C-alpha cells in the first residue's frame, strides 16, 4: 500500500482506547490522507478527551497545532458532521511516536469553544490567532485579543467572505494610526495586555517596533522591577503577509513562491513540506533522484540558515567580526544555489512531482569546492568566537528550561533536543528518502540554554555537511520529475513536442492542476524547528485551506515563560539565541 493512500487509522491504539472510555457513539473517525487519526469530538467532551489523552500510559504530551477552518463552502464533506466552522487540535505523543487530530464542529451562530489553555499553555496564542482570523470565541481565555491584526480591525480575514485583495490606501487612517502610536505610551494600561499591578514600583518599557538585526522588527512590552523583567507580553503581527489567505487565493503550482517566503532563511526547506503534502493529495510517489536532490537543497539551505544564526548571535553578543566571513561562506552556498536553481534566497524550484530543472553540468564541482571550503572556516569561527569566555559568560545560564517546559509550550528544533528529548522529524517520521542517509541527531543534557542551543546548531551544521557529502557521492541517475499525470509542470521537451503533454502543461499552468477532494498533512524538520503544512482540498485547482504551522510562533509564545525574572540584556541574548524570524511568526 502506498504511503499517500486514504486511511482511517482504526488499528491505532488511541481509537480503541477512546472507544472503551467514551463509548463508540461519542466521536466520528474521518479517513484522510493526513497520516494521522482524525477524530471528530463533540464540543462538550473536548476537555474530557484532551485530559484523557494527557493521562494515557504513553500520553499525548504536546499540542502541536490549534486552528480553525471555514467549512461553509466545502462541497465534499461526506462522512463528516454538520459544521459551519471547525476547530482542529493536533496533538503529538513523542513516546508513542504518534499524533492525533481532534476536530470540533461549530455552527455559525454558536461560534464558541472551551479554552484549551488549562491543558496546554500554547493554546493561548493559538486561540488568539484563531479568534483573530476566524472570529471563534474561546470561553475562559485570559486575554482573547487580536494577535495578527491591530485591535481596531473590522472583520476576520481567514473567513471565506473576507476580501483577500488589498483595500484602497487612504492617508486618513495612516494619520489616525500615527496619532494612536504617538499616544500609545501616555494612554497605556496594563489590563488590556493581560498584566496586573502596574504597586507604583514597576516601569513599563516598550522595546520599539523597529529592531536593527536580521531577526525582524517587532515589539515587546516589559514590566520591570528595576532591571528585572517581572512580566512581558510580545506584540506581534507587524509582519503579517496573509500567506494562508494567499493559499486559498493561488493555485497549487503558483503558491510555491509564497511557500518560499514563510521563513526567508529556509527557501527549499520551506518548499519541502508543501510539495510533499500536495504530492500526498495527488497520489504522487517521486523517484529517488528527486528525493536526493531535494535533500541536498534542503541541507544547503539549512547550512545557510545555521551560519546566519551563529554569526548573528556572535554579533549580538558583541563580536561583530565573524559575520562577514560567515556571509562569505553563505556567498559560496549562494553560488551553488544560483548555479542549480537560478536564484539566491527564494529559489521557487521544487515542483509537484519533482524539480523545475535537472542538475546543471558542473554542480558536483561546485559542491566539492564548497565541501572543501566549509570545515576550516567552521573551526576558525568556533575557536575565534564560540570558545571565547565573554560570549560563553553572556550566553550560558540565560533563559534555561527543562523538557517539561519545552513539551508544554510546543518548543521544537534545537531547544527541544537540547532538553534531552531526541525527537527529529528526519528520523522519527522519515520523509523524502531521509532513511537512506547516514547522519546523527545531536541532543542536550536536559537544560536548553543559549550556548547549548548554539552548539547544537553547530553540530547540526556538521551533520548537514555529512549529508551533503552523501548527496554528492551518491546521486542517482534518472528522472527529475515523476511519471504521474499530475506532475506540474510536465517535462519541458515533451511539452514542446507532444500534443498530450502540451495539453497537460496548458491546463496545469493556466487553470491549475486538479487535486481530488481530500486532506493531507506533512511535517518536516525545518532550519528553525518543526514546520508543517496542512492542506484541505475541495476538489478544485486551489487549496481550500492552507494551514502553516511554524516553530517560531511557539518559541515567541514561550518567551515570557522563560525570561520572567531575568534582565534586559538576558532578554536580548535570548532573542538572539532562538533562531526565529518574524515572517515565520506572523506568516
Amino acid at each position: 500500500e502506498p504511503a499517500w493512500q486514504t486511511r482511517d487509522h482504526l488499528d491505532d491504539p488511541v481509537i480503541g482506547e477512546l472507544r472503551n472510555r467514551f463509548g463508540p457513539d461519542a466521536f466520528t473517525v474521518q479517513a484522510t490522507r493526513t497520516g494521522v487519526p482524525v477524530v471528530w469530538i463533540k464540543r462538550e467532551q473536548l476537555l474530557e478527551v484532551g485530559d484523557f489523552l494527557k493521562k494515557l500510559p504513553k500520553p499525548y504530551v504536546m499540542l502541536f497545532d490549534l486552528h480553525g477552518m471555514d467549512e461553509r463552502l466545502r462541497t465534499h464533506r461526506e462522512g463528516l458532521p454538520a459544521a459551519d466552522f471547525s476547530v482542529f487540535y493536533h496533538l503529538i505523543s513523542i513516546d508513542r511516536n504518534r499524533d492525533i487530530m481532534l476536530k470540533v464542529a461549530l455552527a455559525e451562530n454558536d461560534l464558541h469553544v472551551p479554552t484549551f489553555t488549562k491543558l496546554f499553555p500554547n493554546a493561548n496564542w493559538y486561540e488568539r490567532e484563531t479568534w483573530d482570523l476566524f472570529g471563534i470565541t474561546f470561553d475562559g481565555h485570559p486575554n482573547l485579543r487580536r494577535i495578527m491584526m491591530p485591535q481596531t480591525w473590522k472583520g476576520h480575514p481567514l473567513r471565506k467572505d473576507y476580501p483577500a485583495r488589498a483595500t484602497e490606501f487612504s492617508p486618513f487612517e495612516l494619520t489616525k494610526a500615527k496619532q494612536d502610536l504617538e499616544m500609545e505610551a501616555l494612554t497605556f494600561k496594563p489590563e488590556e495586555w493581560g498584566m496586573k499591578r502596574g504597586n507604583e514600583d514597576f516601569m513599563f518599557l516598550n522595546l520599539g517596533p523597529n529592531h536593527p538585526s536580521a531577526h525582524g522588527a517587532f515589539r515587546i512590552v516589559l514590566q520591570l522591577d528595576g532591571e528585572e523583567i517581572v512580566d512581558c507580553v510580545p506584540d506581534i503581527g507587524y509582519h503579517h503577509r496573509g500567506a494562508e489567505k494567499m493559499g486559498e487565493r493561488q493555485s497549487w503550482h503558483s503558491y510555491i513562491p509564497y511557500t518560499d517566503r514563510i521563513e526567508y532563511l529556509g527557501g527549499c526547506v520551506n518548499e519541502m513540506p508543501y510539495v510533499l503534502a500536495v504530492e500526498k493529495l495527488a497520489g504522487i510517489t517521486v523517484p529517488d533522484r528527486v528525493n536526493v536532490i531535494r535533500v541536498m537543497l534542503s541541507e544547503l539551505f539549512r547550512i545557510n540558515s545555521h551560519l546566519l544564526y551563529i554569526s548573528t548571535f556572535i554579533q549580538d553578543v558583541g563580536a561583530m567580526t565573524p559575520v562577514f566571513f560567515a556571509f562569505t561562506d553563505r556567498q559560496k552556498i549562494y553560488d551553488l544555489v544560483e548555479a542549480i536553481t537560478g536564484f539566491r534566497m527564494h529559489p521557487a524550484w521544487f515542483r509537484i512531482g519533482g524539480v523545475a530543472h535537472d542538475l546543471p553540468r558542473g554542480w558536483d564541482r561546485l559542491l566539492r569546492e564548497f565541501l572543501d571550503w566549509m570545515p576550516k572556516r567552521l573551526a576558525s569561527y568556533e575557536k575565534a568566537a564560540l570558545q571565547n569566555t565573554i560570549l560563553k559568560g553572556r550566553s550560558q545560564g540565560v533563559a534555561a528550561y527543562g523538557a517539561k517546559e519545552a513539551l508544554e509550550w510546543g518548543t521544537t528544533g534545537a531547544g527541544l533536543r537540547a532538553t534531552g528529548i531526541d525527537f527529529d522529524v528526519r528520523k522519527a517520521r522519515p520523509y523524502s528518502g531521509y532513511e537512506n542517509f547516514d547522519f546523527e541527531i545531536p541532543v542536550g543534557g536536559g537544560v536548553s540554554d543559549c550556548y547549548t542551543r548554539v552548539m547544537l546548531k553547530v553540530e547540526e551544521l556538521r551533520q548537514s555537511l555529512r549529508i551533503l557529502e552523501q548527496c554528492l557521492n551518491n546521486m542517482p541517475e534518472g528522472p527529475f520529475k515523476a511519471d504521474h499525470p499530475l506532475t506540474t509542470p510536465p517535462p519541458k521537451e515533451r511539452t514542446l513536442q507532444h500534443i498530450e503533454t502540451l495539453i497537460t502543461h496548458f491546463l496545469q499552468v493556466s487553470w491549475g492542476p486538479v487535486m481530488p477532494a481530500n486532506e493531507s498533512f506533512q511535517m518536516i524538520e525545518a532550519t528553525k524547528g518543526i514546520n508543517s503544512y496542512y492542506l484541505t482540498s475541495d476538489g478544485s485547482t486551489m487549496s481550500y485551506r492552507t494551514r502553516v504551522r511554524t516553530p517560531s510562533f511557539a518559541h515567541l509564545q514561550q518567551i515570557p515563560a522563560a525570561i520572567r525574572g531575568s534582565l534586559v540584556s538576558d532578554l536580548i541574548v535570548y532573542l538572539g539565541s532562538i533562531d526565529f524570524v518574524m515572517s515565520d511568526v506572523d506568516r
Partner: protein, 198 residues
C-alpha cells in the same frame, strides 16, 4: 529638466556659487549614511551587501547609523505592512533634510506578490521615493547600482547652501530613465548561455 518641491522649472545654475553647489553635491553623494531599518527579506540582502564579500564600504556607505537623525538615506527594504507603515512614516519624519529614499525589492516598490489585506501596496503611497530596485530580493550588487543611481541623482540636484540667503526650495532633476538609456544595448543581445551548464 528639473522639478520643484518647496511644477517643472529649468536649471538656475556666478560661477563660485556653482562650484560651491557642486562641492556640496559631491560631499553629499560621496558620504551617504544609510539607516539600519529592517523589514523583511530585502534587509537580509541589504546586510549581505554590507558584509565582506560585497563591501559597500568602498562607497562610503558602511557607517550605518542606528538613529534616523544621523542618517541621510532611508532604504525601505521589505514589505510595508499595515502595522509597520506608521512606524515607517514616523521614522522618515524623524529624519532631517536632505533625505533620500531607496525602495528595495518588489514589496517596497509596489507591494510585490502580496496583494493582501494587511500590506500597503508600495512605499510610495505615503513617503516619496527616489530610487526603485526590482527584485525579490535584489542581489547586493543591485543595491550597489541603486546607490550609484542615487549618487547620480544627488550630484545634479540643487539645494540651498544656507537658510540665511538664496532660494529655499529643492530642485530635483527629471532624469532620463535607465530603461530608455539601456535600450540601445539591451535589444542588441542575441545569444545567451543555455541553462543546462554551470
Amino acid at each position: 529638466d528639473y522639478t520643484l518641491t518647496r511644477e517643472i522649472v529649468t536649471d538656475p545654475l556666478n560661477v563660485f556659487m556653482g562650484k560651491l553647489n557642486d562641492m556640496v553635491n559631491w560631499g553629499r553623494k560621496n558620504s551617504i549614511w544609510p539607516y539600519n531599518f529592517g523589514l523583511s527579506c530585502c534587509y537580509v540582502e541589504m546586510v549581505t551587501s554590507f558584509t565582506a564579500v560585497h563591501d559597500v564600504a568602498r562607497f562610503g556607505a558602511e557607517v550605518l547609523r542606528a538613529s534616523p537623525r544621523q542618517a541621510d538615506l532611508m532604504v525601505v527594504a521589505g514589505t510595508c505592512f499595515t502595522k509597520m507603515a506608521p512606524v515607517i512614516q514616523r521614522l522618515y519624519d524623524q529624519m532631517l533634510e536632505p533625505k533620500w529614499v531607496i525602495s528595495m525589492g518588489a514589496c517596497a516598490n509596489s507591494g510585490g506578490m502580496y496583494d493582501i489585506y494587511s500590506v500597503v501596496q508600495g512605499v510610495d503611497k505615503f513617503i516619496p521615493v527616489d530610487v526603485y530596485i526590482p527584485g525579490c530580493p535584489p542581489r547586493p550588487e543591485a543595491y550597489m547600482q541603486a546607490l550609484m543611481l542615487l549618487q547620480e541623482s544627488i550630484g545634479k540636484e540643487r539645494r540651498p547652501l544656507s537658510w540665511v540667503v538664496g532660494d529655499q526650495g529643492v530642485y530635483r532633476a527629471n532624469m532620463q530613465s535607465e530603461r530608455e538609456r539601456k535600450r540601445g544595448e539591451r535589444i542588441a543581445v542575441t545569444n545567451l548561455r543555455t541553462p543546462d551548464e554551470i
